[PDB]
Design a protein around this ligand. Structure first.
Ligand SMILES: Nc1ncnc2c1ncn2[C@@H]1O[C@H](COP(=O)(O)OP(=O)(O)O)[C@@H](O)[C@H]1O
Ligand SMILES: Nc1ncnc2c1ncn2[C@@H]1O[C@H](COP(=O)(O)OP(=O)(O)O)[C@@H](O)[C@H]1O
Ligand SMILES: Nc1ncnc2c1ncn2[C@@H]1O[C@H](COP(=O)(O)OP(=O)(O)O)[C@@H](O)[C@H]1O
Ligand SMILES: [Mg+2]
Ligand SMILES: [Mg+2]
Ligand SMILES: [Mg+2]
Lengths: 529, 527, 44, 520
């Protein structure tokens, strides 16, 4: 047999373990197929009818959630285009936090259409220019589709009606109670002049009954116990101390130097007298509970229990700052008793036990306050993690709505209207970018088709009905979920609202990822290590 | 490539670069065998055999190179060799130069179709110029002598070259006819291992590789008769399985004599024929048989003084029939004396273990025999190859009614004609015409490089001498001065050059239209 | 070890259809080079 | 070409993945299927170290199974949740979930939407919870004797399917008295469970104080009387031995005078500490730190008892039983920081020396002495005692018992069938299957008892349709009787929690149609 040699040059100097893809068939088409196969995985889990996914990582852990961000983070894909898509999804989640699968589907459809656009004979520059023009047009006509706005932000009956649409997409069925709890937690921590913080929401997982036994708390909780014998105090003053509740010593290595029988007998007596004097001076300032963050001693604990002083020890750094900001007090780097400014403004401190777990609850009688804690209940850890993720998504949606009070109709009407407007505008553009504009207009139909496929009905009939409704004269009419027959329904009457800035940022990031992927025609890789 | 991961495949640029590199490597090796001033090669096989040759067809096969382009080039060279004769090294050089000139213009933003279309017109113009530049002569003895000398000058030294030229010319004139074409398979090539000097002459007759078997036979026989036959004389059994059923020893002896009477009858018939032909004792009788002879017949024929042979080839009978003029009969039915041959001097020569027979001195022989002599085996093979090449060149020059001067004046004239016809071609074929004209000037460049002089200055001087005077000014290989090729005695061939140009054009068209080397065959490995 | 079939592999329908379509497209793209008078010659 | 995921990733479709999940759930439930009623049998699990684990509770069996399946872990999670919540019906929720899965398997194979199944499960669970809360029927104002009788009946019903079923009339009063003396916070850490080898099962006693094992002793342990009439317990926490004052100390003694002075001062400090400890009027000295040989010999010359290496939990229990406090310093030993008891003995039980402390009327804790086997029997007895204590604690806070056996399941199934017989459409078949799946409890009970299940189930269905409500199964008479009149009561917090856990497990299992496994 005759063996064919290699090309004398870059092929011979390519070195082992490395690869080369110069042609468009082994590069652009391969990346397009990989992106399509990646988008086809998370395509069935998009709308509220999307199922969950049991993803098992290498650490022998279970992840039964519904958000696409965790799934994409727990895949470990060894593909450059898929890695770029995952990075874009992570950037979108960090910027907003409510649009990952939509961006993935949009990018997949755009790449699948660009595949045939390059196959028919069109180049890459004209396609990129047409896509950019279509994106600019969609961003220009985007603010012209606002049909709702948020009136008040501190009303319980109003905020709960806005995040319900976003919560129902994650938890289908039991969402009204979760929306009400999220609205109450956001109202109880809402100050003035805007400025809403995202780190003021605590999540406590306690195994017990189901989702009907969940309740909100206007304070903080810790999974510790009481060191002393003091049970619960009514009107107590918290005294936070960053230094450990013990006698201070020198930072430099030094030993004591006793003499005869006088110092050897007086040292312990003087130490005990100083400790007793310090304990008395600490409790004489009206303090009842002392919260430390270091190692405690036996003599100090006994002296604190003698004068009825509650001792709470915690080792979490950030928890001490959170407890200080919740009660209004600050920290102290030395054993110094407060006077009148560094006191405590609590209400009730008690130690309870729910679900065979002793926790210290710091309940506050004030309806406002600083931070809050949403005590969650459940029988499994996966359900608790899903509820926590849904609560975080609702908090992010509330923060986005507070940043921008512009509401747009959701479902599948805004995308259809944008596609129709782009198709009507692209018909008056000459050159070769008209085909790219028409393809970009067709990429918006991947959301209603996926929604109809996940609901359990046909997609072409639903798309035709939506197009006919939009051409008749209606705009705020989308697809129906509860209806078993392929019909339409009004989105304004049902209450389907979504964030406009989030969708705008998602579309911008999708267009950026598309124009970044459609710019590399050759990949140069090496060997894994 | 996705269906078969264990299969290598080259693209358009990679395969083209591989082919160009292979062509350059094959051209840079065979560039030292052009002209009589070349260098000799020493090939050593795996067993320990030494071969000293200078031909390009043998070097292209004894180089141990595994490549598809190299295999195709070797096959084309072997085809040219066994179809025409001398025209393999120059063919490979021209093919390599054309491929290099094509690759020089390909890596600039051009399509090989235009280069092929230009090469077609260039080949057409070269053929049209060669059809009128040829010189027709009467083809006498001096022309054939000069052609053979020019063909054999690039093989050995001088004296052996002239001896081989004279022997080839004499053999051709002896086997020459006026109505039938030049037929081969008539001159026997016998090799010997002694006298490597002036001893490779021509023998007017035939020399066999087997002598007599009976020691009582005569060694040197004067005037005798040649009997050509191929009948069996051994104990031939019947086709049907038979068997003897005797009774005593008398019946056994009778059955023994019965099976031998069949050969005794033929022996008596041969004896009677010899007695009727001769009669007295001043003549002899030589019998040439193709099959074996039993010892009984050899002993019976030795009593009458008959020198018979046995076990011969098929070409020997035809050679004897063409030389002596007898009848190669098969049976002893109409055994007439008119079906015999005439001889003059028959003597048996012994060379140790081997034994030969010389059949010389004939009336009008038509099949001679070249006696090759050499010190070793490599020299014998080289002399045999040189004699074969000279015979092929003489046959090609005789079959054609025209002559072509050698040296490198024809290539310069063709290049000048292509240059003059370059602006007369429309389209983008001007680059192809220029490349074809520059590729044909590889022979004078290699000749000047092997002679020991300059290349660019020599080519410029040759072009100036050709443009300043319309003559066939060749290239000298001794002083480097522009000399006339038709004045000294350097002659080539027309049909050979035409076939070489056609093969070069075909190879160029087949290579320039291929840019994909895929190997998706079965591995045939199970385990 | 109780098994129903030894050394047997079964796939789904969508994956098999996609693989067949990809193989057909690859065959068509490989064979599309030799077409028209401006095509090139191949060697095996 | 480069692949998408890493080399070694496994995936499947939806229908085969769900079928495999149902098969795994059925295989898991078939292991703890024979453990239910009183006629059930326990299992024997052996790990890699060669230690056996004999326990009748399904929680320990599911924990010792070591299942690495990504879908079979849903039963272990709800089992642990039920064990941590009420701690009773650990296998009932798993059986109900397995029955629901086996009932919806044909509906899933036929081609039904999982969202409709989840909605039907949620509606059925809500209806069952509402029906249970409606037919609860709790007392409004009862006396203490009625509450004690109810607690005793609940304890006897909870300790009927365990290994101590033959002595259920003795442990009921014990656990009742143990729970009644737990104040209102109900601290489970103040109940000491001691296991001493030797004796019989009926030889178990319950003291009204504290009792711990004898720790290490020196050469001054036999020269002291281990019996006192009215002693005083002094809780300390300082080391009583000849050692250095501080580890980071250096003494630069001059001549022999200062050396002798320091030598005398060390013993003077030791004697002063001993005198300050003895002058408190105590007789029993207890401390967590080990006591040296000097104090042990000093306390034996004044008819005083001492013991070192006292655990923290034992010291806390003794303090809660007596009424003292942990005194680290000996410079403040008054009369309000010392214990008080009426009797103090030191007998030998099973060849091991144990200290007894009882007689104090202000005791808020107790100690249990479990005798019988050697290890597995003692562990089973401790598990049964903990289960009974949890059942009594739940019944105290719920004060609403219901009929046991299988009457509540039959009533829920009848109500679900009557509700499904009204609403048409595809909602009738799902509720019907949910109601038919609840009838597996009496069938499983009859299969474990070895009786006819078909005839008993038919008779129960006929009696429930002709109604005559709290009618369950009977193992003694091999028929049917009144479970409410046979003193068979159970807390209502066990059925609702198990139903909610089963509904959550079903909703989490059905809503899964993909399983991705990463290499390594
Ligand atoms: N109640 C509803 N009615 C109609 N459409 C909905 C409803 N809830 C969610 N959707 C649609 O489902 C899609 C998925 O939303 P979601 O899963 O929250 O985020 P993402 O769009 O990132 O997947 C949205 O585009 C939205 O239009
Ligand atoms: N004596 C000579 N004078 C001039 N030219 C010669 C002479 N001998 C050979 N040549 C030239 O050298 C070239 C190569 O000849 P050779 O190597 O013998 O055979 P081939 O032509 O097959 O390569 C021929 O084309 C011929 O013109
Ligand atoms: N004495 C009894 N009479 C009637 N039914 C009983 C009796 N004891 C137990 N059972 C039934 O046996 C079932 C199993 O209870 P048990 O073994 O205590 O816990 P689990 O439900 O975790 O197995 C209970 O549902 C109960 O109705
Ligand atoms: Mg979202
Ligand atoms: Mg030659
Ligand atoms: Mg139980």
């Amino acid at each position: 047999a005759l063996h064919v040699p290699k090309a004398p040059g870059f092929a011979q100097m390519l070195k082992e373990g490395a690869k080369h893809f110069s042609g468009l068939e082994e590069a652009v088409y391969r990346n397009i197929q990989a992106c399509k196969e990646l988008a086809q995985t998370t395509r069935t889990a998009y709308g509220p009818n999307g199922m969950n996914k049991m993803v098992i990582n290498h650490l022998e852990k279970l992840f039964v959630t519904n958000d696409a961000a965790t799934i994409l983070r727990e895949l470990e894909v060894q593909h450059p285009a898929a890695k770029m898509i995952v990075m874009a999804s992570h950037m979108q989640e960090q910027e907003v936090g409510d649009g990952t699968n939509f961006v993935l589907v949009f990018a997949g459809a755009l790449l699948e259409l660009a595949e045939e656009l390059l196959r028919i004979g069109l180049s890459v520059s004209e396609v990129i220019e047409g896509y950019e023009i279509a994106c600019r047009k969609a961003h220009e006509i985007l603010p012209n589709l606002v049909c709702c706005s948020a009136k008040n932000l501190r009303d319980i009956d109003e905020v709960s009606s806005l995040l319900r649409t976003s919560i129902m997409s994650k938890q289908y069925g039991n969402e009204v109670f979760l929306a009400k709890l999220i609205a109450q937690a956001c109202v109880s921590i809402f100050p003035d002049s805007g400025h809403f913080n995202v780190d003021n929401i605590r999540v406590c997982k306690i195994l017990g009954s189901g989702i009907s036994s969940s309740s909100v708390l206007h304070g903080m909780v810790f999974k510790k116990e009481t060191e002393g014998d003091v049970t619960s105090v009514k009107d107590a003053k918290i005294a936070v101390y960053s230094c450990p509740f013990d006698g201070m010593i020198t930072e430099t290595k030094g030993t004591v130097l006793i003499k005869t029988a006088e110092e050897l007998m007086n040292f312990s007596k003087g130490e005990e007298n100083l400790m007793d004097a310090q304990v008395k001076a600490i409790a004489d300032t009206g303090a009842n509970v002392v919260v430390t963050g270091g190692k405690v001693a036996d003599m100090a604990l006994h002296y604190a229990n003698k004068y009825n002083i509650m001792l709470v020890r915690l080792n979490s750094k950030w928890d001490l700052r959170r407890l200080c900001k919740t009660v209004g007090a600050t920290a102290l780097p030395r054993l110094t008793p407060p006077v009148l400014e560094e006191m405590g403004h609590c209400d009730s401190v008690y130690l309870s036990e729910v679900g065979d777990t002793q926790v210290v609850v710091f309940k506050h009688e004030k309806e406002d306050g600083a931070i809050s804690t949403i005590v969650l209940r459940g029988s499994t850890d996966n359900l608790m993690d899903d509820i926590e993720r849904a609560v975080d998504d609702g908090v992010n949606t509330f923060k986005v709505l507070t940043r921008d009070k512009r509401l747009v109709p959701g479902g599948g009407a805004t995308e259809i209207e944008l596609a129709k407007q782009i198709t009507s505008y692209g018909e008056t553009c000459p050159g070769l970018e008209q085909y790219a504009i028409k393809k970009f207009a067709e990429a918006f139909e991947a959301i209603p088709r996926a929604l109809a496929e996940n609901s359990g009905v046909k997609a072409n009939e639903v798309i035709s009905k939506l197009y006919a409704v939009h051409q008749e004269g209606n705009k705020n009419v989308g697809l129906d979920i509860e209806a078993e027959v392929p019909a339409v329904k009004d989105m304004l009457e049902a209450g389907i609202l979504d964030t406009y800035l989030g969708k705008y940022w998602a579309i911008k990031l999708a267009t950026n990822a598309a124009v970044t992927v459609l710019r590399v025609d050759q990949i140069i890789m090496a060997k894994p290590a | 490539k996705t269906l078969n991961p264990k299969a290598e495949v080259a693209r358009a640029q990679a395969a083209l670069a591989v082919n160009i590199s292979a062509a350059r490597g094959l051209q840079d090796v065979l560039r030292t065998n052009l002209g009589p001033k070349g260098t000799m090669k020493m090939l050593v096989s795996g067993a320990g055999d030494i071969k000293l040759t200078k031909d390009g067809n043998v070097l292209l096969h004894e180089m141990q190179i595994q490549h598809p382009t190299a295999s195709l080039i070797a096959k084309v060279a072997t085809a040219q060799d066994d179809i025409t004769g001398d025209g393999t090294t120059s063919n490979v050089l021209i093919i390599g130069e054309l491929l290099k000139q094509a690759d020089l213009y390909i890596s600039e933003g051009l399509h090989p179709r235009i280069i092929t279309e230009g090469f077609e017109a260039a080949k057409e113009k070269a053929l049209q110029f060669l059809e009128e530049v040829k010189v027709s002569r009467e083809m006498d003895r001096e022309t054939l002598i000069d052609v053979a000398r020019t063909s054999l000058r690039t093989k050995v030294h001088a004296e052996l070259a002239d001896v081989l030229t004279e022997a080839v010319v004499d053999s051709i004139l002896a086997i020459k006819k006026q109505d039938e074409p030049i037929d081969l398979f008539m001159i026997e090539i016998m090799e010997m291992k002694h006298k490597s000097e002036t001893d490779t002459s021509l023998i007017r007759g035939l020399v066999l590789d087997h002598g007599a078997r009976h020691p009582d036979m005569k060694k040197r026989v004067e005037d005798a008769y040649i009997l050509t036959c191929n009948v069996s004389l051994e104990y031939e059994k019947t086709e049907v399985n038979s068997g003897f059923f005797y009774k005593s020893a008398e019946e056994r002896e009778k059955l023994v004599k019965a099976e031998r009477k069949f050969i005794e009858d033929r022996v008596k018939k041969i004896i009677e024929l010899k007695r009727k032909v001769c009669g007295d004792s001043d003549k002899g009788f030589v019998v040439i048989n193709q099959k074996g002879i039993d010892p009984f017949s050899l002993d019976a024929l030795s009593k009458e003084g008959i020198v018979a042979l046995r076990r011969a080839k098929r070409r020997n009978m035809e050679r004897l029939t063409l030389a002596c003029g007898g009848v190669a009969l098969n049976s002893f039915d109409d055994l007439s004396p008119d079906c015999l041959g005439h001889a003059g001097l028959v003597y048996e020569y012994t060379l140790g273990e081997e034994k030969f027979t010389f059949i010389e001195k004939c009336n009008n022989p038509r099949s001679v025999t070249l006696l090759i002599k050499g010190p070793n085996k490599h020299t014998l093979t080289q002399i045999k190859d040189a004699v074969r090449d000279g015979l092929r060149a003489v046959k090609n020059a005789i079959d054609d009614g025209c002559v072509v001067p050698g040296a490198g004046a024809v290539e310069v004239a063709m290049a000048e004609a292509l240059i003059k016809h370059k602006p007369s071609v429309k389209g983008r074929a001007q680059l192809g015409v220029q490349a074809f004209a520059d590729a044909l000037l590889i022979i004078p460049k290699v000749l000047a490089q092997n002679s020991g002089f300059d290349l660019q200055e020599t080519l410029v001087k040759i072009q100036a001498e050709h443009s300043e005077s319309g003559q066939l000014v060749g290239v000298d290989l001794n002083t480097g001065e522009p000399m006339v090729a038709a004045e000294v005695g350097v002659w080539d061939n027309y049909c050979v050059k035409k076939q070489l140009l056609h093969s070069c054009t075909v190879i160029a068209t087949n290579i320039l239209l291929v840019d994909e080397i895929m190997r998706a065959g079965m591995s045939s490995l199970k385990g | 070890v109780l098994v129903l079939s030894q050394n047997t592999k079964r796939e789904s329908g969508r994956k098999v259809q996609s693989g067949n379509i990809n193989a057909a497209k690859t065959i068509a793209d490989i064979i599309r080079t030799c077409l028209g008078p401006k095509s090139m010659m191949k060697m095996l | 070409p480069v692949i998408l995921l890493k080399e070694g990733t496994d995936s499947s479709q939806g229908i085969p993945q769900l079928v495999s999940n149902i098969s795994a759930c059925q295989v898991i439930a078939e292991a703890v299927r024979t453990t239910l009623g009183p006629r059930g049998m326990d299992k024997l699990i052996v790990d890699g170290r060669g230690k056996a684990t004999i326990s009748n509770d399904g929680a320990t069996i599911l924990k010792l199974l070591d299942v690495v399946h990504p879908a079979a872990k849903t039963l272990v999670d709800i089992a642990k949740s039920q064990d941590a919540e009420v701690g009773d019906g650990t296998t009932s929720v798993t059986l109900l979930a397995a029955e629901f899965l086996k009932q919806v398997k044909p509906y899933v194979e036929e081609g039904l939407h999982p969202q409709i199944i989840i909605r039907a499960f949620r509606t059925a669970t809500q209806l069952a919870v509402n029906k249970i809360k409606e037919i609860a029927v709790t007392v409004k104002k009862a006396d203490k004797v009625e509450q004690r009788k109810l607690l005793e009946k609940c304890a006897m019903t909870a300790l009927s399917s365990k290994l101590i079923s033959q002595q259920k009339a003795f442990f009921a009063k014990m656990v009742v008295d143990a729970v009644m003396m737990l104040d209102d916070l109900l601290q489970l850490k103040m109940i000491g469970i001691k296991k001493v080898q030797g004796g019989a099962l009926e030889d178990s006693q319950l003291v009204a104080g504290v009792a711990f094992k004898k720790t290490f002793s020196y050469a001054g342990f036999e020269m002291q009387p281990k019996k006192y009439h009215n002693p005083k317990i002094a809780l300390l926490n300082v080391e009583l031995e000849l050692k250095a004052e501080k580890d980071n100390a250096e003494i630069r003694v001059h001549t022999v005078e200062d050396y002798q002075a320091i030598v005398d001062a060390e013993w003077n400090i030791l004697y002063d500490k001993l005198e300050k400890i003895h002058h408190s009027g105590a007789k029993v000295v207890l401390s967590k730190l080990p006591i040296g040989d000097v104090a042990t010999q000093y306390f034996a010359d004044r008819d005083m008892f001492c013991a070192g290496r006292v655990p923290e939990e034992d010291l806390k229990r003794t303090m809660m039983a007596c009424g003292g406090s942990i005194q680290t310093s000996v410079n403040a030993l008054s009369a309000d920081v010392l214990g008080r008891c009426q009797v103090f003995e030191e007998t030998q039980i099973g060849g091991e020396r144990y200290n007894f402390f009882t007689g104090c009327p202000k005791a808020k804790t107790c100690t249990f002495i479990l005798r019988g086997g050697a290890e597995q029997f003692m562990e089973e007895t401790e598990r049964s005692l903990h289960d009974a204590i949890m059942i009594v604690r739940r019944a105290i806070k719920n004060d609403s018992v219901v009929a046991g056996g299988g009457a509540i399941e039959m009533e829920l199934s009848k109500y679900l069938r009557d509700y499904s017989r009204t609403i048409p459409g595809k909602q009738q078949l799902l509720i019907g299957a949910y109601a038919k799946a609840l009838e597996i409890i009496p069938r499983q009970l009859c299969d474990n008892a070895g009786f006819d299940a078909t005839n008993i189930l038919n008779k129960l269905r006929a009696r429930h349709a002709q109604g005559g409500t709290w009618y369950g199964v009977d193992i003694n008479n091999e028929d049917i009787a009144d479970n409410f009149e046979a003193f068979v009561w159970e807390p209502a917090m066990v059925r609702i929690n198990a139903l909610t856990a089963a509904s959550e497990a079903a909703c989490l299992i059905v809503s899964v149609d993909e399983t991705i496994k990463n290499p390594r």
